[PDB]
Amino acid sequence: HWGYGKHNGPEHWHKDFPIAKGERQSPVDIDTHTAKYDPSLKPLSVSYDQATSLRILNNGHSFQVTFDDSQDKAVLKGGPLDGTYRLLQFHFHWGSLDGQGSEHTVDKKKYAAELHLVHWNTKYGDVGKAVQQPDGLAVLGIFLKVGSAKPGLQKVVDVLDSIKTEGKSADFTNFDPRGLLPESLDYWTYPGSLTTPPLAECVTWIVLKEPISVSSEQVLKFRKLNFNGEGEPEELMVDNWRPAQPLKNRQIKASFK
Numbered sequence: 001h002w003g004y005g006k007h008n009g010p011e012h013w014h015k016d017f018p019i020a021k022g023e024r025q026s027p028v029d030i031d032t033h034t035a036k037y038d039p040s041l042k043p044l045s046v047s048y049d050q051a052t053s054l055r056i057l058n059n060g061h062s063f064q065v066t067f068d069d070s071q072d073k074a075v076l077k078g079g080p081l082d083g084t085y086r087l088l089q090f091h092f093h094w095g096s097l098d099g100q101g102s103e104h105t106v107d108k109k110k111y112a113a114e115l116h117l118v119h120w121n122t123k124y125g126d127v128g129k130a131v132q133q134p135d136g137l138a139v140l141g142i143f144l145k146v147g148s149a150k151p152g153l154q155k156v157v158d159v160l161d162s163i164k165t166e167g168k169s170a171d172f173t174n175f176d177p178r179g180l181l182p183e184s185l186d187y188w189t190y191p192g193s194l195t196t197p198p199l200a201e202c203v204t205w206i207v208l209k210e211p212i213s214v215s216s217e218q219v220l221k222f223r224k225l226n227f228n229g230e231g232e233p234e235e236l237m238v239d240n241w242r243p244a245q246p247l248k249n250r251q252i253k254a255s256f257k
């Protein structure tokens with residue numbers, strides 16, 4: 001199966017998922033001087049007050065927090081989007097050291113980690129149908145840098161020992177994802193793909209300019225996770241990021257001047 005190692009990592013994925021070499025793959029480097037300010041872009045509408053978290057899961061590639069997406073409770077609208085997108089889950093990508101871990105880069109800068117809040121378009125009715133459409137998903141990406149602790153992340157941090165290895169899940173109710181957001185909703189946007197198999201070209205990316213700060217202790221707990229299942233040879237879940245892919249025939253737009 002696919003992973004992030006030498007023999008199964010990103011350079012291999014195209015064999016099982018040939019769209020890996022497609023025309024709208026993610027992530028990309030965001031060249032800040034080339035991105036064009038688009039005054040037609042709307043403010044992003046992030047409506048998370050009725051979010052209902054369910055479970056936290058280690059799936060062997062990241063950890064994720066899953067939400068009830070059976071009604072319009074935690075939705076993304078506006079910005080570059082037409083219609084309403086329901087929050088399904090969030091997860092992270094991170095490095096072995098603080099100088100790598102993000103998927104998107106900004107003028108070639110890599111952040112220590114990247115948070116992805118994954119949403120799907122309710123007009124396609126379910127996420128499996130949405131992933132087959134060019135406007136099916138909207139992923140909100142937020143960079144993490146290491147400095148001061150993010151208080152809203154601590155509840156996540158402190159349960160990671162209970163999902164150390166692949167397979168493992170736990171109850172994770174009453175988690176408020178508003179506590180993971182930076183002050184500003186200024187963003188870059190472009191059409192792209194899932195950054196993990198199946199690499200489907202179904203995503204409107206919305207990448208926030210302002211990173212959140214997390215502490216060294218917080219990210220160190222991410223790195224204590226394992227890619228492997230319980231009792232198997234221990235391989236730290238680190239460097240679970242896909243590198244930047246060719247931009248090709250795409251424009252990155254900025255919501256801000």
Ligand SMILES: [N]S(=O)(=O)[C][C][C][C]C1234B567B89%10B%11%12%13B85%14B%1158B%12%11%15B%139%12B%1061B%12%112C5%153B%14874
Nearest residue numbers: 116118127131139193194195196198
């Ligand atoms: N890193 S990322 O945010 O680009 C990928 C998000 C993958 C989200 C999924 B799509 B398929 B299935 B549908 B449902 B399951 B599988 B992939 B994951 C979820 B949706």
Ligand SMILES: [Zn+2]
Nearest residue numbers: 091093116195
């Ligand atoms: Zn992701």
